[PDB]
Protein backbone atom coordinates (compact mmCIF):
# COMPACT_ATOMS: atom_id res chain seq x y z
CA UNK A 1 0.00 0.00 0.00
CA UNK A 2 0.91 3.69 -0.30
CA UNK A 3 -0.24 6.99 1.19
CA UNK A 4 1.29 10.18 2.53
CA UNK A 5 1.30 10.97 6.22
CA UNK A 6 -1.49 13.50 5.78
CA UNK A 7 -3.82 11.05 4.05
CA UNK A 8 -3.56 8.17 6.53
CA UNK A 9 -4.28 10.63 9.34
CA UNK A 10 -7.47 11.87 7.69
CA UNK A 11 -8.97 8.41 7.18
CA UNK A 12 -8.15 7.10 10.65
CA UNK A 13 -9.19 10.52 11.94
CA UNK A 14 -12.40 10.29 9.93
CA UNK A 15 -13.14 6.98 11.66
CA UNK A 16 -13.07 8.24 15.24
CA UNK A 17 -14.99 11.36 14.27
CA UNK A 18 -17.66 8.95 13.04
CA UNK A 19 -17.64 6.67 16.09
CA UNK A 20 -17.81 9.61 18.49
CA UNK A 21 -20.94 10.86 16.70
CA UNK A 22 -22.76 7.67 15.72
CA UNK A 23 -22.87 6.73 19.44
CA UNK A 24 -23.80 9.64 21.72
CA UNK A 25 -24.94 8.90 25.28
CA UNK A 26 -26.47 12.16 26.47
CA UNK A 27 -26.85 12.97 30.13
CA UNK A 28 -30.17 14.72 30.68
CA UNK A 29 -30.91 17.59 33.05
CA UNK A 30 -34.68 17.66 33.38
CA UNK A 31 -34.91 20.94 35.27
CA UNK A 32 -38.13 22.43 33.87
CA UNK A 33 -40.82 22.25 31.18
CA UNK A 34 -38.31 21.67 28.40
CA UNK A 35 -37.51 18.41 30.17
CA UNK A 36 -40.80 17.03 28.86
CA UNK A 37 -39.83 17.48 25.21
CA UNK A 38 -36.63 15.55 25.85
CA UNK A 39 -38.92 12.68 26.83
CA UNK A 40 -40.99 13.03 23.67
CA UNK A 41 -37.83 13.07 21.57
CA UNK A 42 -37.15 9.62 23.01
CA UNK A 43 -40.83 8.66 22.72
CA UNK A 44 -42.01 6.35 19.91
CA UNK A 45 -42.65 9.07 17.33
CA UNK A 46 -39.05 10.23 16.89
CA UNK A 47 -37.22 7.47 18.79
CA UNK A 48 -33.96 9.34 19.32
CA UNK A 49 -32.52 5.92 20.14
CA UNK A 50 -32.79 4.97 16.46
CA UNK A 51 -29.67 7.10 15.87
CA UNK A 52 -27.75 5.31 18.62
CA UNK A 53 -28.54 8.02 21.19
CA UNK A 54 -29.34 5.80 24.19
CA UNK A 55 -31.87 7.00 26.76
CA UNK A 56 -30.00 6.64 30.08
CA UNK A 57 -26.30 6.68 30.88
CA UNK A 58 -24.34 7.06 34.09
CA UNK A 59 -23.46 10.77 34.45
CA UNK A 60 -19.85 9.62 34.85
CA UNK A 61 -20.00 7.69 31.57
CA UNK A 62 -21.97 10.24 29.55
CA UNK A 63 -21.01 11.76 26.21
CA UNK A 64 -23.01 15.02 26.02
CA UNK A 65 -25.03 17.08 28.48
CA UNK A 66 -28.35 18.61 27.42
CA UNK A 67 -29.13 21.38 29.89
CA UNK A 68 -32.94 21.46 29.75
CA UNK A 69 -34.80 24.08 31.76
CA UNK A 70 -33.94 26.90 34.09
CA UNK A 71 -30.67 27.03 36.04
CA UNK A 72 -31.29 28.41 39.52
CA UNK A 73 -28.48 29.95 41.53
CA UNK A 74 -29.02 27.21 44.11
CA UNK A 75 -28.73 24.50 41.46
CA UNK A 76 -25.82 26.13 39.62
CA UNK A 77 -22.99 24.61 41.71
CA UNK A 78 -24.35 21.10 41.17
CA UNK A 79 -24.34 21.59 37.40
CA UNK A 80 -20.69 22.65 37.35
CA UNK A 81 -19.77 19.73 39.59
CA UNK A 82 -21.45 17.34 37.17
CA UNK A 83 -19.70 18.99 34.24
CA UNK A 84 -16.25 18.38 35.71
CA UNK A 85 -17.03 14.68 36.21
CA UNK A 86 -17.75 14.14 32.51
CA UNK A 87 -14.93 12.23 30.79
CA UNK A 88 -13.55 13.85 27.66
CA UNK A 89 -14.73 14.49 25.01
CA UNK A 90 -17.73 16.29 26.55
CA UNK A 91 -20.16 18.35 24.49
CA UNK A 92 -22.72 20.55 26.25
CA UNK A 93 -25.99 21.40 24.47
CA UNK A 94 -28.21 24.21 25.74
CA UNK A 95 -31.90 23.40 25.28
CA UNK A 96 -34.70 25.92 25.54
CA UNK A 97 -34.71 29.63 26.22
CA UNK A 98 -34.20 29.69 29.98
CA UNK A 99 -31.04 27.61 29.58
CA UNK A 100 -29.73 30.12 27.01
CA UNK A 101 -30.34 33.63 28.30
CA UNK A 102 -32.69 33.25 31.22
CA UNK A 103 -35.67 33.02 28.87
CA UNK A 104 -38.86 34.17 30.55
CA UNK A 105 -36.89 34.56 33.81
CA UNK A 106 -33.98 36.63 32.51
CA UNK A 107 -34.56 39.30 35.16
CA UNK A 108 -34.99 36.93 38.12
CA UNK A 109 -32.55 37.36 40.98
CA UNK A 110 -32.28 33.60 41.51
CA UNK A 111 -31.83 32.59 37.85
CA UNK A 112 -28.48 32.19 36.11
CA UNK A 113 -28.82 34.33 32.98
CA UNK A 114 -27.84 31.64 30.53
CA UNK A 115 -26.22 28.35 31.45
CA UNK A 116 -23.28 29.31 29.24
CA UNK A 117 -22.01 31.28 32.24
CA UNK A 118 -21.55 28.03 34.15
CA UNK A 119 -20.16 25.92 31.30
CA UNK A 120 -19.10 26.30 27.65
CA UNK A 121 -22.02 25.33 25.42
CA UNK A 122 -21.61 23.67 22.02
CA UNK A 123 -25.07 23.80 20.41
CA UNK A 124 -27.83 26.26 21.28
CA UNK A 125 -31.42 25.10 20.70
CA UNK A 126 -34.03 27.90 20.77
CA UNK A 127 -37.74 27.65 21.53
CA UNK A 128 -39.46 27.44 24.93
CA UNK A 129 -39.93 24.52 24.70
CA UNK A 130 -38.02 23.50 21.56
CA UNK A 131 -40.42 21.17 19.78
CA UNK A 132 -39.27 17.58 20.19
CA UNK A 133 -38.36 17.59 16.51
CA UNK A 134 -36.22 20.73 16.71
CA UNK A 135 -34.22 19.26 19.57
CA UNK A 136 -33.58 16.24 17.38
CA UNK A 137 -32.25 18.58 14.69
CA UNK A 138 -29.74 19.96 17.18
CA UNK A 139 -28.50 16.49 18.07
CA UNK A 140 -28.14 15.68 14.39
CA UNK A 141 -26.47 19.05 13.93
CA UNK A 142 -24.09 18.21 16.78
CA UNK A 143 -23.03 15.00 15.05
CA UNK A 144 -22.05 17.01 11.98
CA UNK A 145 -20.23 19.52 14.18
CA UNK A 146 -18.27 16.53 15.44
CA UNK A 147 -17.91 15.38 11.84
CA UNK A 148 -16.10 18.67 11.13
CA UNK A 149 -13.38 17.88 13.69
CA UNK A 150 -9.81 17.20 12.57
CA UNK A 151 -7.92 16.38 15.76
CA UNK A 152 -5.26 14.10 14.30
CA UNK A 153 -4.63 16.28 11.25
CA UNK A 154 -3.88 19.19 13.57
CA UNK A 155 -1.75 16.85 15.68
CA UNK A 156 0.21 15.69 12.63
CA UNK A 157 0.80 19.38 11.83
CA UNK A 158 2.19 20.33 15.25
Amino acid sequence: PSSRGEYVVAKLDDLINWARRSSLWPMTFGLACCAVEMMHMAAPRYDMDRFGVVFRASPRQSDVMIVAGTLTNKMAPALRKVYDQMPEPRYVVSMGSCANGGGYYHYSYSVVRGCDRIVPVDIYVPGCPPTAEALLYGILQLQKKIKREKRLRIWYRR
Binding site: P77, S108, R117, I118
Partner: protein
Protein backbone atom coordinates in the same frame (compact mmCIF):
# COMPACT_ATOMS: atom_id res chain seq x y z
CA UNK B 1 -78.93 34.98 37.70
CA UNK B 2 -79.88 37.28 34.83
CA UNK B 3 -79.93 37.30 31.03
CA UNK B 4 -76.64 39.11 30.42
CA UNK B 5 -73.83 36.89 29.06
CA UNK B 6 -71.16 39.57 29.66
CA UNK B 7 -71.78 39.91 33.41
CA UNK B 8 -71.21 37.58 36.34
CA UNK B 9 -74.46 36.17 37.78
CA UNK B 10 -74.70 37.02 41.47
CA UNK B 11 -75.42 34.26 43.99
CA UNK B 12 -77.08 36.21 46.78
CA UNK B 13 -78.14 33.19 48.85
CA UNK B 14 -74.54 32.25 49.62
CA UNK B 15 -73.79 35.91 50.29
CA UNK B 16 -76.59 36.12 52.86
CA UNK B 17 -75.34 33.01 54.65
CA UNK B 18 -71.87 34.48 55.15
CA UNK B 19 -73.34 37.64 56.67
CA UNK B 20 -75.43 35.43 58.94
CA UNK B 21 -72.31 33.39 59.68
CA UNK B 22 -70.51 36.71 60.09
CA UNK B 23 -71.67 37.75 63.54
CA UNK B 24 -71.49 34.10 64.57
CA UNK B 25 -67.71 34.42 64.82
CA UNK B 26 -67.70 38.13 65.72
CA UNK B 27 -69.77 37.41 68.83
CA UNK B 28 -67.88 34.29 69.88
CA UNK B 29 -64.30 35.66 69.93
CA UNK B 30 -64.66 39.43 70.41
CA UNK B 31 -61.32 39.63 72.23
CA UNK B 32 -59.45 39.41 68.90
CA UNK B 33 -61.71 39.86 65.86
CA UNK B 34 -61.37 43.49 64.77
CA UNK B 35 -63.29 43.61 61.49
CA UNK B 36 -65.40 41.16 59.48
CA UNK B 37 -66.35 41.98 55.90
CA UNK B 38 -67.93 40.08 53.02
CA UNK B 39 -66.93 40.66 49.40
CA UNK B 40 -69.45 40.74 46.58
CA UNK B 41 -67.97 37.57 45.04
CA UNK B 42 -68.94 35.49 48.09
CA UNK B 43 -65.78 35.40 50.17
CA UNK B 44 -65.80 36.00 53.91
CA UNK B 45 -63.02 38.00 55.55
CA UNK B 46 -62.17 37.99 59.26
CA UNK B 47 -59.73 40.53 60.68
CA UNK B 48 -58.07 39.37 63.90
CA UNK B 49 -55.61 40.93 66.28
CA UNK B 50 -52.31 39.08 65.73
CA UNK B 51 -52.34 37.57 69.22
CA UNK B 52 -55.52 35.66 68.42
CA UNK B 53 -53.92 33.47 65.76
CA UNK B 54 -54.30 30.29 67.81
CA UNK B 55 -57.61 31.04 69.57
CA UNK B 56 -59.33 31.85 66.28
CA UNK B 57 -57.72 29.32 63.94
CA UNK B 58 -58.02 26.60 66.59
CA UNK B 59 -61.69 27.47 67.09
CA UNK B 60 -62.80 27.18 63.47
CA UNK B 61 -60.82 23.96 63.03
CA UNK B 62 -62.85 22.21 65.73
CA UNK B 63 -66.06 24.11 66.56
CA UNK B 64 -69.26 22.19 65.88
CA UNK B 65 -70.42 24.65 63.21
CA UNK B 66 -67.15 25.70 61.53
CA UNK B 67 -65.35 22.37 61.04
CA UNK B 68 -62.69 23.93 58.78
CA UNK B 69 -60.55 20.81 58.64
CA UNK B 70 -57.97 21.80 56.02
CA UNK B 71 -55.76 24.87 55.59
CA UNK B 72 -56.02 25.94 51.97
CA UNK B 73 -53.23 28.51 51.86
CA UNK B 74 -50.95 30.62 54.04
CA UNK B 75 -48.97 33.61 52.80
CA UNK B 76 -48.27 37.27 53.50
CA UNK B 77 -48.71 40.48 51.52
CA UNK B 78 -45.96 43.04 51.88
CA UNK B 79 -47.39 46.55 52.14
CA UNK B 80 -44.73 49.18 52.93
CA UNK B 81 -47.32 51.96 53.39
CA UNK B 82 -48.50 50.72 56.81
CA UNK B 83 -46.81 50.68 60.20
CA UNK B 84 -47.33 46.91 60.28
CA UNK B 85 -46.03 46.48 56.75
CA UNK B 86 -46.68 42.75 56.44
CA UNK B 87 -50.11 41.14 56.51
CA UNK B 88 -50.56 37.40 57.05
CA UNK B 89 -53.48 35.60 55.41
CA UNK B 90 -54.94 32.17 56.20
CA UNK B 91 -57.33 30.48 53.76
CA UNK B 92 -59.47 27.78 55.36
CA UNK B 93 -61.56 25.01 53.79
CA UNK B 94 -64.57 23.16 55.21
CA UNK B 95 -65.54 19.91 53.52
CA UNK B 96 -68.61 19.42 55.71
CA UNK B 97 -70.19 22.80 55.02
CA UNK B 98 -68.47 23.30 51.64
CA UNK B 99 -67.28 26.86 52.21
CA UNK B 100 -64.07 28.85 52.52
CA UNK B 101 -63.14 31.65 54.91
CA UNK B 102 -60.13 33.97 54.92
CA UNK B 103 -58.42 35.10 58.13
CA UNK B 104 -55.91 37.96 58.15
CA UNK B 105 -53.57 39.46 60.74
CA UNK B 106 -50.96 42.21 60.79
CA UNK B 107 -47.34 42.20 61.91
CA UNK B 108 -43.95 43.65 60.99
CA UNK B 109 -40.29 42.66 60.87
CA UNK B 110 -39.69 42.53 64.63
CA UNK B 111 -43.02 41.25 66.05
CA UNK B 112 -43.20 37.48 65.59
CA UNK B 113 -46.46 35.59 65.16
CA UNK B 114 -47.06 32.36 67.06
CA UNK B 115 -46.56 29.33 64.86
CA UNK B 116 -49.88 27.81 63.84
CA UNK B 117 -48.29 24.40 63.24
CA UNK B 118 -50.11 23.04 66.33
CA UNK B 119 -53.46 24.02 64.82
CA UNK B 120 -52.61 22.57 61.39
CA UNK B 121 -49.70 20.42 60.30
CA UNK B 122 -50.14 22.02 56.86
CA UNK B 123 -48.39 25.23 57.92
CA UNK B 124 -45.17 23.34 58.69
CA UNK B 125 -43.57 24.68 55.49
CA UNK B 126 -45.79 27.62 54.55
CA UNK B 127 -44.40 29.35 57.64
CA UNK B 128 -40.83 28.65 56.55
CA UNK B 129 -41.63 30.30 53.22
CA UNK B 130 -43.10 33.45 54.76
CA UNK B 131 -40.00 33.86 56.90
CA UNK B 132 -37.76 32.96 53.96
CA UNK B 133 -39.29 35.39 51.47
CA UNK B 134 -40.68 38.15 53.70
CA UNK B 135 -38.69 38.04 56.94
CA UNK B 136 -41.54 37.67 59.44
CA UNK B 137 -40.51 35.42 62.32
CA UNK B 138 -42.77 32.68 63.68
CA UNK B 139 -42.45 31.85 67.37
CA UNK B 140 -42.09 28.25 68.54
CA UNK B 141 -41.77 26.94 65.00
CA UNK B 142 -40.30 23.41 65.17
CA UNK B 143 -37.68 24.16 62.50
CA UNK B 144 -37.54 27.62 60.92
CA UNK B 145 -35.09 28.34 58.10
CA UNK B 146 -34.83 29.16 54.41
CA UNK B 147 -36.86 26.89 52.14
CA UNK B 148 -36.67 28.61 48.75
CA UNK B 149 -33.85 31.14 48.49
CA UNK B 150 -30.26 30.13 47.89
CA UNK B 151 -27.99 29.47 50.84
CA UNK B 152 -26.67 32.63 52.43
CA UNK B 153 -29.13 34.90 50.63
CA UNK B 154 -28.37 38.21 52.36
CA UNK B 155 -31.87 39.55 51.93
CA UNK B 156 -35.59 38.85 51.90
CA UNK B 157 -36.73 38.75 48.26
CA UNK B 158 -40.47 39.24 48.17
CA UNK B 159 -40.29 42.51 50.10
CA UNK B 160 -41.42 45.39 47.91
CA UNK B 161 -38.08 47.17 48.42
CA UNK B 162 -35.95 44.29 47.10
CA UNK B 163 -34.77 44.94 43.52
CA UNK B 164 -36.09 42.42 41.02
CA UNK B 165 -32.62 41.65 39.65
CA UNK B 166 -31.12 40.94 43.07
CA UNK B 167 -27.72 42.10 44.28
CA UNK B 168 -25.31 39.38 43.09
CA UNK B 169 -25.22 37.31 39.92
CA UNK B 170 -23.28 34.07 39.75
CA UNK B 171 -20.72 32.91 37.19
CA UNK B 172 -18.01 30.28 36.88
CA UNK B 173 -14.37 31.33 37.23
CA UNK B 174 -11.47 29.23 35.99
CA UNK B 175 -8.89 31.02 38.15
CA UNK B 176 -10.42 29.56 41.33
CA UNK B 177 -12.15 26.50 39.78
CA UNK B 178 -15.46 27.21 41.51
CA UNK B 179 -18.66 29.15 41.03
CA UNK B 180 -18.37 32.68 42.39
CA UNK B 181 -20.50 35.77 42.99
CA UNK B 182 -20.19 39.44 42.10
CA UNK B 183 -22.34 42.59 42.09
CA UNK B 184 -25.05 42.27 39.47
CA UNK B 185 -24.42 43.69 36.00
CA UNK B 186 -27.03 43.37 33.26
CA UNK B 187 -26.26 43.34 29.55
CA UNK B 188 -29.62 45.06 29.06
CA UNK B 189 -31.34 46.92 31.87
CA UNK B 190 -34.90 45.98 32.76
CA UNK B 191 -37.02 48.57 30.98
CA UNK B 192 -39.60 49.99 33.38
CA UNK B 193 -42.77 50.74 31.46
CA UNK B 194 -45.21 53.21 33.00
CA UNK B 195 -48.78 52.02 32.46
CA UNK B 196 -51.03 53.86 34.91
CA UNK B 197 -53.84 55.65 33.15
CA UNK B 198 -54.37 59.18 34.52
CA UNK B 199 -58.19 58.88 34.53
CA UNK B 200 -60.21 57.43 37.39
CA UNK B 201 -61.14 53.85 36.51
CA UNK B 202 -63.80 52.77 39.04
CA UNK B 203 -65.78 55.48 40.88
CA UNK B 204 -67.00 52.91 43.41
CA UNK B 205 -63.57 52.39 45.00
CA UNK B 206 -62.70 56.09 45.03
CA UNK B 207 -60.68 57.04 48.08
CA UNK B 208 -62.17 60.20 49.63
CA UNK B 209 -59.99 63.32 49.87
CA UNK B 210 -57.46 63.85 52.66
Amino acid sequence: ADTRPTVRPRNDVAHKQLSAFGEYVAEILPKYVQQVQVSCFNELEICIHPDGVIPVLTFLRDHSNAQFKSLADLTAVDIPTRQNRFEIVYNLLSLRFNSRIRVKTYTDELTPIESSVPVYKAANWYEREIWDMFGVFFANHPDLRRILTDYGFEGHPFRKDFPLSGYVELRYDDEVKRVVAEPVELAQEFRKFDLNSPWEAFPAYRQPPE
